[PDB]
């Protein structure tokens, strides 16, 4: 599985 | 800026 969050300006 | 964190088994 992958999972992320981020930030670019705003999380699977 | 692009940021995040990430894990898919381990954050620019």
Known sequence: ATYF????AXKX
Chains 1, 2 share one sequence.
């Open 5 to 8: 969050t981020y930030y670019s």
